[PDB]
Structure formats: structure tokens, C-alpha cells
Amino acid sequence: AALRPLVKPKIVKKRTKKFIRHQSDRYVKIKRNWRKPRGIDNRVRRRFKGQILMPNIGYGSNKKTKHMLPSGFRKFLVHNVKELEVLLMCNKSYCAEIAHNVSSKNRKAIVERAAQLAIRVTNPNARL
Amino acid sequence: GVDIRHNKDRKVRRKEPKSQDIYLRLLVKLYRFLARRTNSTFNQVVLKRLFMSRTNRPPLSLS
Amino acid sequence: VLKKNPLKNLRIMLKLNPYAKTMRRNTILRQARNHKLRVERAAAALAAKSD
Amino acid sequence: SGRLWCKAIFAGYKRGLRNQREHTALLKIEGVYARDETEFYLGKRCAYVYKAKNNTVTPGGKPNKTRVIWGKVTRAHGNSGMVRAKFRSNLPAKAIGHRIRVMLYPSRI
Amino acid sequence: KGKPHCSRNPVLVRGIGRYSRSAMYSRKALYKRKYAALATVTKPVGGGTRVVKLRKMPRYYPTEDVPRKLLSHGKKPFSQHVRKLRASITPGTILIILTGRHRGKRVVFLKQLSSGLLLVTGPLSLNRVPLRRTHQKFVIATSTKIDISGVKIPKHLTDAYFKKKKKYEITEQRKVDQKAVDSQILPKIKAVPQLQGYLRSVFALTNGVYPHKLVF
Amino acid sequence: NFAELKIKRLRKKFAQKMLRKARRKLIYEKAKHYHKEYRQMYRTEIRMARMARKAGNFYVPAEPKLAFVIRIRGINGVSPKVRKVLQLLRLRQIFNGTFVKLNKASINMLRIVEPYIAWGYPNLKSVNELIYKRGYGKINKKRIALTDNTLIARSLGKYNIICMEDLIHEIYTVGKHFKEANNFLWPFKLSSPRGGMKKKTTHFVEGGDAGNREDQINRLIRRMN
Amino acid sequence: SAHLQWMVVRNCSSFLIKRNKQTYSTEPNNLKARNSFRYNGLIHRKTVGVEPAADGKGVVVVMKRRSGQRKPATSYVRTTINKNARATLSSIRHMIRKNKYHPDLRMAAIRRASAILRSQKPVM
Amino acid sequence: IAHPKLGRRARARIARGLR
RNA sequence: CCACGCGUCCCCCGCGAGCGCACGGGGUCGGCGGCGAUGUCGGCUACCCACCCGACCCGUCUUGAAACACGGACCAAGGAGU
RNA sequence: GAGAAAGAGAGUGGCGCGGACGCUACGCCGCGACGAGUAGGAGGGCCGCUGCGGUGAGCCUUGAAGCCUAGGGCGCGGGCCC
Ligand SMILES: [Mg+2]
Ligand SMILES: [Mg+2]
Ligand SMILES: [Mg+2]
Ligand SMILES: [Mg+2]
Ligand SMILES: [Mg+2]
Ligand SMILES: [Mg+2]
Ligand SMILES: [Mg+2]
Ligand SMILES: [Mg+2]
Ligand SMILES: [Mg+2]
Ligand SMILES: [Mg+2]
Ligand SMILES: [Mg+2]
Ligand SMILES: [Mg+2]
Ligand SMILES: [Mg+2]
Ligand SMILES: [Mg+2]
Ligand SMILES: [Mg+2]
Ligand SMILES: [Mg+2]
Ligand SMILES: [Mg+2]
Ligand SMILES: [Mg+2]
């Protein structure tokens, strides 16, 4: 089995779809990253019915289950082995993640140090 | 809905000084405690006066 | 605190109003006693039907 | 060795004229046609049973193609014995006018 | 210490005693009943005497630990809930089992077991239904009863007797209890005409047959 | 030594327990006397109507002094005079409701607002279930739901109002401190009327729901509550 | 003093590390390794620290002494504890409790000693 | 009796008489 | 009947113990059942397709734009309060 | 936390070595009511880009920047990590 967290609440998320920016589906020049549109006759901005939704604050996640992975953990981006004695104490809440640019002969040292220190790694078998 | 007007809904006054001075903020940490935890209102006035701006606490003279 | 309903729930009602216990005792005694009295008048009327 | 489910038809979602709410099915049960008469079916497990392409499990048996979406019957609707159901995942509109079984087993009799 | 009495208030409705506080002062007779005012063992060792500490300190501490829950009151465990039947189910009632592999079959109900469940046999000579438990909710109860009050159900069969162990092979005392209760039930239901054919037959719904309209 | 400290704190804890128990006996016998007073108030009007009828004369009863006022029409498009009188009657949301004692200033304030409200003369059962089910208190301008008698007694103890049924007695028998007790009560937030409204935009006389239905408000509190 | 040093080290220190909406402090004598006034290992007159030994068994417990504050070489005292897991924790408990030596974090030291001993008994 | 200062001896007398 | 006993002066007529049940400062079970190694189990989101309800194309000037108002074929880089 | 201006105040005579979390005080927590928005104004950005002083005994030929991706994800979102 893996390394189970301390507490594992049911993570209720209010919305699972992303917010695509209005008329991102039309053009290639319009990238789908959300921009609140300042049009004066704009059908989305003034909230018509059946239109693209807007990202209000009320879609914000619960603070107890925010940034929380489906395993129950939270990430922490780790570059070297000296950044696992940091999570030596946050064993049950915060899990480690190895950076992309980190070499193989250092990534496996990170992985076996985290296996000693009982810290779950999100990507423990990355390159090899 | 409710027919409130939300114009003056937010009190404008300071919660903290706009200074990153650290001796002033340690005096704030002492008088936050004394104003929160005594019943004397001298400490609340001294808390509110450490909060202020340079042009709100003008220098009185020795005269 | 969660507001429990004093009209449905009973010990909240007694927590707010301890005389409500004797008003709701005396009225259950009253309902049962008047019920017995009306059943006795109905059975006496059936005896009058037999006579 | 016969049928143990009443026949019901998924008429539509619970809807208004310019809005529908897909969390609540409208079920039309055969034979009951009044609110005086719909009282027996409140709280019954209802189910939309459908087949598929690839095999899935079947408890108390071996895997086959058939699949379900369970639910329950919540409250009457209208005056013609129409009723509301809530399924644990919302019904596809594939199911409009197709047989939902409405069981008997949460009995109160 | 004295021998305990029972509650001198007869329960009128739930939560309300039939006698007020002064009447219960009188009935309890408080007027004449007034009043006024570990961790170490020492063991011998072949040395001296060693003061062993039981309840030792823990060997390990987890790096992060949950707090204690808030205390709430009415949330009893399952084994001490209050158990209810429906009104339509009395011992002797014929039932229509609706959910198991014995679905649709008509069955004589015996008694209300300790964990809420019903005890069941439509006798195994008739419709191949053993001494089984059945859940109250999952069962249509018809209005067909037998005069079952003069039977002796064995006292050694409860939830701990029917609860599953872990190929399933029928033990001997299952057969012995099955026979010892069927020899008491089956002649009692051959006394009612056409009842054994009813209990061998299965319930089913055909066309034009609606359970709200039909009385059973 | 602490052989004195623990017995002194036990004597203090026992003293405040005995004080609380005497307060609960006070609240009990006050609620009993209030029940007797309501019996006498209800039978007095019947007895006087009977004596007037057997003397042949008529008996105009006491013109009612306590109304319950419900805002039935929404925020949008309200004349400003009606706006100001509604927000002195503390009917801001739709389907709110406040108790209001009646006199010459108050009745005329109510009939400025009259197309926007439904107001009537509530029964003792209406006053009861409004205080028990929807009755919260404006404590330190927060809306604390009234769960104990101490929430009422810490704010209204100086008007000799120490429990919830004493608050009910004040509201129903409009007393000296009706202003203070009613203003302690937050404006009631009733639900939409179960069964419905016959017509929102017309007076009760004209086959509608606005205006002064007199004691038919006790039909309507029961289904907005 | 101590608060004066904390008002400087609280945001612009090099042991501080801020990413993934978390914050930590990688300083050499920090129980629980997190950025706080309570646990900081540089700004107090008295401080414990729990480190694994150079030999791969047991815990070196670091104490900050009282006299030589401005003398960083003869400021810290090491004690190596290479025992069972019960008496190692009992020694750290007595050392921080019965000296009345900064008892804010006796339990944090016991957690950290236990986590080191967990990591120091062999792997599954 | 039930208000604190003036009913102090009264509540004390009831508390003694309960024995 | 939310009334408790004693002792005295007056008038008119302050610490008793023990347990236990719970309509009592927000859910628990000290209750269970199934299927699981080459075909199944879980992944809302992201790939395709289907169905129902909704659903006019953006910017802009406007009292009012989907307009039979003007600008816009598509894309990459540059591009405007210094 | 308790309906009631203010002391679990001091004085003078008649065995077992045990007790969770916390408090980046710019932190953490508790109560209530509230949430429309063009022109506009303000706040917060652990949103983003390029360069400089510090710093991470940072990363990198055991493969950095970039680019592609039906893969796993986080955040209301800007975006970001794999
Ligand atoms: Mg336009
Ligand atoms: Mg417009
Ligand atoms: Mg609103
Ligand atoms: Mg506004
Ligand atoms: Mg403003
Ligand atoms: Mg209008
Ligand atoms: Mg209705
Ligand atoms: Mg359409
Ligand atoms: Mg233009
Ligand atoms: Mg122009
Ligand atoms: Mg024009
Ligand atoms: Mg304009
Ligand atoms: Mg045109
Ligand atoms: Mg033209
Ligand atoms: Mg033009
Ligand atoms: Mg053109
Ligand atoms: Mg560009
Ligand atoms: Mg807004």
C-alpha cells in the first residue's frame, strides 16, 4: 500500500470544468485562459441564460480541502535531498514532489531518502 | 433582496500602522495586548494614536 | 448553537419554559379523562338503544 | 418466477418552460393516475436498466452487458399521479420514454 | 444498599411522567427520608525488589495527530437501538420475500430476532426456504395468518447463530433445527385448505395487476 | 493549604447553583400566573358580551392594540415615502414581519404603506409560535437565535423581562416596555405562504392579500410559519 | 533581543522557503522546521534541536547554553543518545521538562526524535 | 428570594433546610 | 400542589452522598452483504459521439445593436498614459 | 458564559517524575449580517514577463531554455506543478 495521510475528508468541489474565455472555441488566436470581457453589448459579461459562466468567488473551494490532492496530501516542490528534512515533520499532511529539471542520479537519491523518512512522493518512478 | 445601501458599509479607520518600522510595531504588539486585556481606555487611545500617520500625530512643543 | 424547535422538540421547550411540562401533563390527563367520559355517555346511549 | 417491478416511464426531467432541472426525474407509473393513489409508491427504489457495449459486473452472478442507475421515488407531482424521482446520477435524455422499473421492496405495508 | 424499586411515574407519553413533582415527593416519601453530612507493582527479582511500572510510556509518537471529538449524546450504538415491526406483521404471518434469491416466495414468519431481523421459514418441504433471517423492510406482508401461538421455537437460535462464518456446507444442527420447527409448523398449515399450494406458489405481477389497487 | 480554597470554591459553586434553581422556580410560577391571566382575559370578554346580550344592549370590545405586519411586496420600484415608512417599520426583505402596537401615529404609518403589507391582529397562539419558531434577538446588533433565557434576561432584565414566556406576555399584553421588547426582537423572516396568495397586488377587501385583514392574519401566520 | 531579531528574520531570512502556499524554515535547530517565532532556532536564549547522529544510530540533542550568546562556537552543546526508543524519548523529556528548559517544544522534540528513530530502524 | 443580593439569606436558609 | 423540618421576638386574623435514563451546547453504529488476475475495478475534469433544456457574433458609437451601422479571411511576432 | 457596580485577595485580635494541537500575533480562532453592476475609483495577487542587488553549499550533458502532448493534478481565476 501507499502512505496514507492523517485525515482524509471527502473533497467536495463545486465545479470540475474549467473556465474557458468567451469565444475561445471560435478562433485559434483566442486562447482559452479566462479574461473577463469588457464588452458593452457582451452576452456573457452581463450574464445571459445559457451562456459561458464567469468565475465568481462563490466557486471557491473549502479551506480545509483546498490544494488537496485526491490522496489527501498537499504537494511541495522539492529540488534537492536537503528539502526533505523539511517535510520530515509534516509527514501526514504535506507530500513531496520532485522538480522536472532534476537529474536522474539525484532523483533516485531523493526517492530513497523519502522512503527512509516515510514521506510519500507523487512521482516516485519518474525517469529511471 | 434587502434594501440596504452599502456605501458606508466599511469603516475607513486604521487597523495597523502603514509603517514597516519595527520598534513602532513592537509598541503596537504591547499596546494591542494592553488595550485588549485591560479595561482602561487610555490604552485604547494610545493604541489608536500609535496607529496614526505623521500628520495626524503632530509634534507638540515643550512650551 | 443549533436552534432546535421548541414546538416540535420538548426539552428545549422545557429549557425555555418549565411550566409547559405541567400544561402538557394536565392537558393529556384532560384529553384522556374527557375521552373516557364521552365513551361512557356513548355506551349509556347504547344501553338506551337496547332499552 | 415473474415480474417484481412496477412499470414506469421516464416522462421528462423536473422542468419549467424555459428551464429544466436534471436532478429530478418525472416518472409516470402505469395504472396510478391521481394523488389519492400515488401514496403507495413514495420511497420505492426505482431503477433505469440499460445495456451497453462492454461487459461490467453484476453482483450475485457473473459479468454481462446490462447496467443500472438506481434511485428512489420522492414525492408526487401534479394531479395525474405523476411522481418525482431522484437518481444517484442524473438520467440521460436517451431515457425519455423508456421503461424505468420501479420496485416494491422498500415496503411500508 | 437497598433493593431497587421501579419508576414510580408511569410513563404517560414519552418524556412526561403522570405525577407532578409534589405528588412524586409524596409517593417517593422524601419527607421522612432526609439526610445530612495503582500504577506500580513491586516484584522480587533474583537484584533486590524492582518497582515495575504498569501503564508504560509509549514507544512512538506520530508526527502529527488528530484532536478529540466534541461530545454528543443520543448517538447510541446499533446493538442497543429500539426495535420495531410493522403493524401488519405478527408471528404466523405469511410474507412475500422481495429481494433475495428466494424472491417472490410466500413464507411463514416466526419471530422478531434481537437485531431487528425477522425469523423465517416457509417450510423447506414446500418452497425450499430454510430457517433464514429476513429484513422487515424488504418484505410484503399479506393478511394471511396461522394459529402459531402453540409452537416452541428453540431458544438457541439468534443473530449469532445465523450470522455468516466465512464452499458452504450445511451443518447437522441446521438440519435438526429445520426439522424440529417444520414438524411443528407444517401440520399447522396443512389444517388450512389450499394453503400449502399457496406457499409453494410464487408471487408475481402480470398485466393489469397494480399493487396500489390490490389488497393483500 | 488548599483545604480552605476548595471548600470556598465549592461553596461558591453551590451558591450559584442554588441561585439558578431559585431563578427557575421564579420562571415557573411566573409562567403559571401568566396562564391564569390569559384565562381571565379570554373569559372576561365572553362574559361581558353575554351580559350585554342578555341586557339586550351591545358590547363593542376593546379596539385591538397589537398588530403583526408582514411585507408582501418586493424591493423593486417603491415610492420613497413608502420606502421610509417601511424601513421604520423594519420590513426590509419581502415576507418579513414585525409586531407593532397600535395608536394614531402607527395606524397612519401603516396605511401609507398599505399596498405593500398585510397586517392583522394576532392571537396568543400566533404570538407564541412566532416567538418560539422564528423569534431571534438583536443582541449587540447580532442576530442570536433565542436558545436560553439568559439571552433574553441579559438584554431585557432591567425591564423585568427574564424569560421567553415573559417576552411573550409583554408582546401580547402590550405593556410599558413594548418598544424595548419588540425592538429586541429581530424582524421575523417568514417563509413564502404555503398554499399561496390569492392576489398580491390588491387589498383583502377586493379579493386580494394587501392591507388590513383583521384576525385573518392568524390564518396566514400559520402557513408562513 | 528576541522579538527584534524576529521582526527582521520573519520574512527576509535565507532559511525561509516559500512555495506551494506553504512556508518552512530550514535553520539548523528548528523543531517542526516551520517558520514561527515559537520554534525558531537562532533568536532565543535557549533552544533545543534534535538531529540524527553521524553514526547511523540515535539522536544528538543540541542545547543552547546561557552564557555565551554572542560566541557561536561554544554556544551549543551536543549530547548523543544511542539507546532504545523509549529511553531516548524519556531522556529528551526529562532534559527539557526537569531543567525547565524552554518547555514550549518538549513535545515537538519528542515527535522529532521519534520520527528520526522511525527513519533509523531499517526500511520495509 | 431569587434575586441575588436581597435573597441571599433566603436562599441560604432554603439550602440549610434541605437537610 | 416548583408546599416541609425545628427553636424563638413581632402582628392582625449556604459544602449530603452514590449510581442511572435521556425529545438536553449540530452523527453515530461497541451493525452488515457482495465481487475481485487476463478482464475486470476507480478517474467529475481532458479526446470523440449521442440525447434533453438553454442557446443570434465579437469590438464599438449609442436613448436603443444580432442588426439591412462601421472594423474583422486565418495565423505568428511587434503594438498604445511613457 | 455568567440576568444583576465590583477579590476562586493577603493579614491581626474575640508509591508512580506524567499532562495532545497551538502563537508565520501580518498568526490563528469565534460570532452575526451581507454579495447586481457600464463610465469610474480602490484593494489583494504564493498571477505572469525582462533585467539588477541579495540568497537557495539551488537546478543542469545521468540532458537547461524552447516546442508538442487522447497522461496525473492543483487554484473561483490570472496561471502553475508534474
Ligand atoms: Mg454589439
Ligand atoms: Mg447595453
Ligand atoms: Mg441577497
Ligand atoms: Mg453595490
Ligand atoms: Mg464606501
Ligand atoms: Mg413592480
Ligand atoms: Mg404543494
Ligand atoms: Mg431549444
Ligand atoms: Mg464604431
Ligand atoms: Mg460620436
Ligand atoms: Mg443613433
Ligand atoms: Mg451611454
Ligand atoms: Mg435592420
Ligand atoms: Mg452601409
Ligand atoms: Mg464609422
Ligand atoms: Mg470588412
Ligand atoms: Mg503579441
Ligand atoms: Mg459586485
Contacts of B54 (CB under 8 A, 6+ apart): none
Count Cβ neighbours within 10 Å for each residue of D48-65 and write b for 16 or more, e otherwise: beeeeeeeeeeeeeeeee
Query: Which of D4, D39, D109 is opposite residue E104, by nearest beta carbon?
Result: D4
In whole angstroms, give the CA distance from residue F165 to residue F32: 10
CB-based contacts of G62, cutoff 8 Å, min separation 6: G29, G47, G48, G49, G50, G51, G76, G77, G78
How many angstroms does the Cα of residue A34 sit away from the middle of ligand 16? Answer: 28
Q: Count Cβ atoms below 10 Å from residue F89 Cβ, excluding itself.
A: 23
Strand J, CB < 7 A, residues 23-42 of F: 23
Long-range contact set of residues F63-67: C-beta below 8 Å, sequence gap at least 24: F64/F102, F64/F121, F64/F214, F65/F101, F65/F102, F65/F174, F66/F99, F66/F100, F66/F101, F66/F102, F66/F121, F66/F122, F66/F171, F66/F172, F66/F174, F67/F99, F67/F100, F67/F101, F67/F102, F67/F110, F67/F119, F67/F120, F67/F121, F67/F122
* Beta-bridge partner residues of E76: none
Ordered DSSP codes for A56-86? -GGGPPPSTTSSB-TTS-B--EE-SGGGSSS
Own/partner pairs, B48-55, CB within 8 angstroms, 24+ separation: B48/B14, B50/B17, B50/B24, B51/B14, B51/B15, B51/B16, B51/B17, B52/B14, B52/B17, B53/B18
Do A89 and E62 count as a contact with CB atoms less than 8 A apart?
no
Alpha-carbon span F189 to F167, nearest angstrom = 18
Q: Dihedral of CA D92/D95/D97/D101: which sign?
A: negative
Q: CA–CA separation, G34 vs A89, rounded Å?
A: 9
Terminal C-alpha separation, chain D = 22
Q: Write out chain F residues lying below 8 Å of H4, CB-based.
A: 19
CA distances from A21 to A24, A34, A53 (A): 6, 4, 9
SS (H, E, C) E99-131: CCCCCCEEEEEEEECCCCCEEECCCHHHHCCCC
- Check: CB of residue F152 under 8 Å from CB of residue F161: yes
Which residues from F are below 8 Å from C17, CB to CB?
A: 27, 31, 163-165
Q: For A54 and I70, how far is CA from C1' in angstroms?
A: 30
Q: What's the residue count for chain A?
A: 128
G104 CB inside 7 Å of strand J: no
Q: List subunits contacting chain C, requiring 3 or more Cβ pairs under 8 Å.
A: E, F
Residue among D98, A100, F151 at smallest CA distance from F143: F151
Q: In the numeric block, which cell numbers belong to residue G4? A: 527584534
Residues 11-40, chain B, touching G (beta carbon < 8 A)? 22, 25-26, 29
The alpha carbon of A40 and the centre of ligand 3 are apart by a number of angstroms equal to 25
Contact F97, F71 (CB under 8 A): yes
Cα maximum dimension of chain C: 65
DSSP per-residue letters across E39-65: -EEEEEE--EEEEEESSPPPS---SS-
* E18 and chain C in contact, CB less than 8 A: yes
Residues 1-19 of H with CB under 8 A from E: 19
* Inter-chain CB proximity G86 and E63 less than 8 Å: no
H1, H10 Cβ separation under 8 angstroms: yes
Name the DSSP class of D2: -
Task: With beta carbons less than 8 A apart as the criterion, state whether D23 and D85 touch.
Answer: no
The length of chain E in residues reads 216
- CA neighbor of G47 nearest in space, from G63, G34, G71, G35: G63
- Using CA atoms, how far apart are residues G98 and E18, in angstroms rounded to an integer? 62
Residues on chain C touching E16 (C-beta within 8 angstroms): 21, 24-25, 28
- Chain D residues with CB under 8 Å of E210 CB are 6, 30-32
Beta bridge partners of G13: none
All residues at 6 or more sequence positions from E12 whose CB lies less than 8 Å from its CB, including other chains: C25, C28, C29, E18
Q: Is the CB of A62 under 7 A from strand I?
A: no
Reading the block at residue G68, the C-alpha cell is 555565551
Is-contact G38 G104, C-beta < 8 A? yes
Contact E129, E122 (CB under 8 A): yes
Give the nearest chain F residue to B5 (CA atoms). F92
Whole-number distance in Å between A15 CA and J76 C1': 9
Q: Which amino acid is at A16?
A: T
Residues 6+ apart with CB under 8 A from G13: G25, G27
The nucleotide lying nearest E68 (C-alpha to C1') is J20
Phi, psi of F128 (to 5 degrees): -55, -60
Residue A20 approaches strand J within 7 Å at CB: no
G20 vs A contacts (CB less than 8 Å): 67, 74-77
How far is CA E1 from each of CA E4, G41, rounded to the nearest angstrom? 9, 62
Which residue type is seen at A84? L
CA D84 and chain centroid, separation: 9
The single residue listed with the C-alpha cell 473551494 is A61
Surface-to-core class of residue G93, CB atoms within 10 Å of its CB (0-12 exposed, 13-18 middle, 19+ buried)? middle
Count other Cβ atoms within 10 Å, centred on residue F68: 24
Burial letters for E127-146: b for 16+ Cβ neighbours within 10 Å, e otherwise? Answer: bebbbbbbebebbbbbebbb
The dihedral sign for the CA sequence A84, A87, A89, A95: negative
Nucleotide nearest A29 (Cα, C1'): I75
Among positive and negative, which fits the CA dihedral H11, H13, H16, H19? negative
Identify the three-state secondary structure at position G49: strand
Closest Cα partner for E91 from E45, E9, E148? E148
Q: Resolution reached, in Å?
A: 3.4
Pairing of strands E118-120, E132-134: antiparallel
User: Which of C11, C22, C28 has the CB atom closest to E13's CB atom?
Assistant: C28
Using the 8-state DSSP alphabet, how is residue G34 labeled?
-
Query: Whole-angstrom Cα distance, residue G50 to residue G105?
Result: 11
Grid coordinates belonging to A74: 498537499
Which of residues 19 through 38 in chain A touch G, CB cutoff 8 A?
Answer: none
- Distance (Å, whole) CA D102 – CA D105: 9
Chains F and B touch (3+ CB pairs under 8 A): yes
Q: Do C23 and F35 touch (CB under 8 A)?
A: yes
Using the mean position of ligand 4's atoms as its centre, give its distance from the Cα of residue B6 in Å. 6
Classify burial at D37, counting beta carbons within 10 Å of its beta carbon; exposed 0-12, middle 13-18, buried 19 or more: middle
Residues contacting residue B12 through CB under 8 Å, at least 6 positions apart = none
G80: left (phi over 0), alpha (psi -120 to 50) or beta: beta
Q: Give the integer Cα–Cα distance in Å for A52 and E9.
A: 67
Determine the Cα–Cα distance for residues E154 and E179; give it in Å rounded to an integer: 12
Report the alpha-carbon angle G19-G24-G25, nearest 5: 130
User: Taken in order A82, A86, A89, A94, is the CA torsion positive or negative?
Assistant: negative
Strand partners, F66: F101
Whether CB of F91 is under 7 Å from strand J: the answer is no
Q: Which residues pair with E11 in a beta bridge?
A: E17
**Cα separation of D25 and D92, whole Å?**
10
**Stretch (H or E) spanning F68:** strand F66-71
Element spanning C49, H or E: helix C20-50
Q: Nearest ligand to the C-alpha of residue F200?
A: 6
Q: Determine contact, residues E140/E86, Cβ cutoff 8 Å.
A: no
Q: What is the CB neighbour count within 10 angstroms for residue A95?
A: 24
Instruction: Give CB contacts under 8 A, 24+ apart, made by A69-76.
Output: A69/A95, A69/A122, A70/A11, A71/A2, A71/A5, A71/A95, A71/A120, A72/A4, A72/A5, A72/A6, A72/A7, A72/A8, A72/A9, A73/A5, A73/A120, A73/A122, A74/G20, A74/G22, A75/A122, A75/G20, A76/G19, A76/G20, A76/G22
Which stretch of DSSP H or E encloses residue E180?
helix E172-189
Do residues A69 and A95 lie in contact, with contact meaning Cβ atoms separated by under 8 Å?
A: yes
Indicate yes or no: strand I within 7 A of the C-beta of E54: no
Q: Which of H19, H10, H15 is nearest to F14 (CA)?
A: H15
**SS3 (DSSP) at F25:** helix
Query: Which uninterrupted H or E stretch holds D9?
Result: strand D6-15
Whole-angstrom CA distances from F161 to A33, F24, F118 are 61, 14, 29
What's the grid cell of residue F179?
Answer: 418598544
D100's enclosing H/E stretch is strand D99-102
| Range 68-87, chain G: CB under 7 Å to any strand J atom | none
Protein CA G93 to sugar C1' J19 (Å): 12
A86 vs B36: CA distance, rounded Å: 36
